[PDB]
Design a protein around this ligand. Structure first.
Ligand SMILES: Nc1nc2cc3[nH]c(NCc4cccc5ccccc45)nc3cc2c(=O)[nH]1
Ligand SMILES: Nc1nc2cc3[nH]c(NCc4cccc5ccccc45)nc3cc2c(=O)[nH]1
Ligand SMILES: [Zn+2]
Ligand SMILES: [Zn+2]
Lengths: 359, 359
């Protein structure tokens, strides 16, 4: 199979649908990547993750570089082998996580640099390597975003050279650059230009899903995404409320990752086509209906709201498992519905039908 | 299928192997029943519970009578439907749980009587109904056990009559009486006699796994089990360390339930043929071996100790799932190994081979 080959099969407006062919599998785009932060998609076996329809999962160098550690994962045969997932894994570069969770050379925390970042993701056996960037604090001044963006672009080229330096990783993996510039269009252009000049396999929009709200997020996507190379995937990092995803696809985004389905799943929130439900609610205690009346997932085929209600209220691990599986399943069905409606050129109507029922 | 039919296919010493045929399935004996205390076998889907090889699961009226409640489970189509398990369920009668967890008529707690107990288990749709008894506090004086046992036998006959009173339950379910008498042989005889005079489908030994230690537990089984009707299953409630099970089978016990595989599973303990391991131990951090070198379970086929180590140390739900599944799988393999070695008449050698390696 190819190392990295992105093919757009259909379009509608700025929305695209296609595939990314990678050595470890095909990624159907627009793609939702379940997040597997500690070398697990929480409360799901990889197989279950796969059955929900995910093509690729997201991992973080920051978390794994600490536990169990990058060299150790390498010694253990790589992340894929370690967690039992043999399909593409996208590893975040460590830039956002060192921020929220914890110089020119890089970042010291309790050192992550572009070179080490790439080296770690290589150690992990990452298929898609994220340039190591400086996630832009939001809000931030024009001047601040600018300098923060430009460090990121300098780090982008360093990322590029480190990656290109490692034959094995260059041959088998993909490197995505990350656009920064905050909400500022000219900064966003500057950054897209620098990234394009360097050249990457894919272009992420970083700096969003920073509490800017959907409106301002979409506003930025509106100008930011068309500045990226059309022929490469566009990855909106960390975005995934169902309606965020729809509106970002409408704006040219092909890839998504979000802790929302999993985490909200464990907390009682079930996504349905009629909007999320909180299954803990007493109203579900004798509700024999499945979580969602349409959902094809194993959970909706087998268990009632009443049972899951019971389960979540009792803190039962099976509650978390069922909710999470349903929710990832839901997310994947939405992506599938998005892919098919784009390839059928009715994505517009989907989005409106979706929004209409969901809200 | 029959309502309740116990057939002994082979014997070795006091050990028996056979089947209990019930309307909702066959129970291979000696049987280990995973415990599903809140209408779930913790961190396992029923299907997973089934794949490990369990034929029957244990439920408690005490827990379910409170949450979600017995009438409500009934309204919801029964326990089987509710939790997605369609095979026999054995419901404990509420006698031990009102004790550890919370008159002649019954017990008031913050009222459970023989009649209500049976009515609740009928509401649950229990296949095997436990007489409602007074679990004997241990230790206890001869006089005390005696009076506590005799209330239990009076409750046993009440249990019997209530059960027999409910046509539907009498037709489709089984009623097991429970022998009491503590460590006292004559009390144990008295009780077996009263139970036999009443007549039940099966005979449980209650009052053990009360911290008496394996020695004194086996000592009591030694005289207590032969007093029960040979032609009926013998159920040792709440017993299940792997070596407890082997020694109880050697003493004529056909059925077991124990929270040990599940709970110890969630806490880091993996059973192996070379004895339990605590997977949290640093020694497993780069151990690419499966939990147990022989275990056929999905977990041992797929994941390394190092990964599960990582998982459990990080408090990852998948850690609990994998450990629990392995452990129930282990327990079922032990029961299978016990069944086959009895039917092959080499159960003696198994027990010694087992004990030899395991300790
Ligand atoms: N390298 C890089 N990685 C990023 C990862 C991002 N993740 C997100 N959103 C995740 C998220 C999920 C759920 C709730 C959240 C609340 C506050 C902030 C983030 C939340 N944004 C990311 C941006 C970057 C980035 O710019 N660079
Ligand atoms: N009706 C009835 N039910 C019983 C249930 C019993 N369960 C046990 N053992 C469970 C158990 C599992 C693990 C650790 C434990 C520690 C202390 C006490 C019990 C533990 N014994 C039971 C007896 C009865 C009974 O006599 N009657
Ligand atoms: Zn579902
Ligand atoms: Zn195993």
């Amino acid at each position: 199979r190819p190392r990295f080959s992105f093919s757009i099969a259909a379009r509608e407006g700025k929305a695209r649908t296609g595939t990314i062919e990678m050595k470890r599998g095909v990624i159907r785009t627009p793609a939702f990547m379940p997040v597997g932060t500690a070398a697990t998609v929480k409360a799901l076996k990889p197989e279950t993750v796969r059955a929900t329809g995910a093509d690729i999962i997201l991992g973080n160098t920051y978390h794994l570089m600490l536990r169990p550690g990058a060299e150790r994962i390498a010694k253990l045969g790589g992340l894929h082998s370690f967690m039992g997932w043999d399909r593409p894994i996208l590893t975040d570069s460590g830039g956002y996580q060192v921020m929220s969770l914890s110089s020119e050379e890089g970042v010291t925390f309790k050192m992550l640099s572009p070179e080490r970042s790439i080296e770690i993701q290589h150690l992990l056996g990452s298929d898609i390597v994220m340039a190591f960037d400086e996630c832009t604090p939001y809000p931030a001044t024009p001047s601040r975003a600018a300098s923060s963006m430009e460090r990121s672009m300098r780090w982008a080229k360093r990322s590029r050279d480190a990656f290109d330096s490692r034959k094995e990783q260059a041959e088998n993996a993909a490197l995505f650059g990350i656009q920064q510039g905050s909400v500022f269009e000219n900064l966003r252009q500057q950054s897209a230009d620098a990234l394009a000049e360097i050249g990457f396999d894919g272009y992420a929009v970083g700096g969003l899903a920073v509490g800017e709200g959907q409106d301002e997020m979409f506003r930025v996507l509106d100008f930011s995404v068309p500045m990226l190379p059309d022929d490469k995937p566009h990855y909106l990092m960390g975005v995934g409320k169902p309606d965020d995803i729809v509106g970002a696809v409408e704006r040219g985004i092909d890839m998504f990752d979000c802790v929302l389905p999993t985490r909200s799943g464990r907390n009682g929130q079930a996504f349905t086509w009629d909007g999320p439900i909180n299954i803990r609610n007493a109203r579900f205690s004798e509700d024999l209906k499945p979580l969602d009346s349409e959902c094809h997932c194993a959970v909706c085929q087998k268990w009632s709201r009443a049972y899951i209600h019971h389960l979540i209220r009792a803190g039962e691990i099976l509650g978390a498992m069922l909710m999470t599986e349903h929710n990832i399943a839901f997310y994947q069905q939405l992506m599938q519905k998005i892919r098919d409606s784009i390839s059928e050129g009715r994505f517009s109507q989907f989005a409106q039908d979706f929004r209409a029922r969901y809200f």
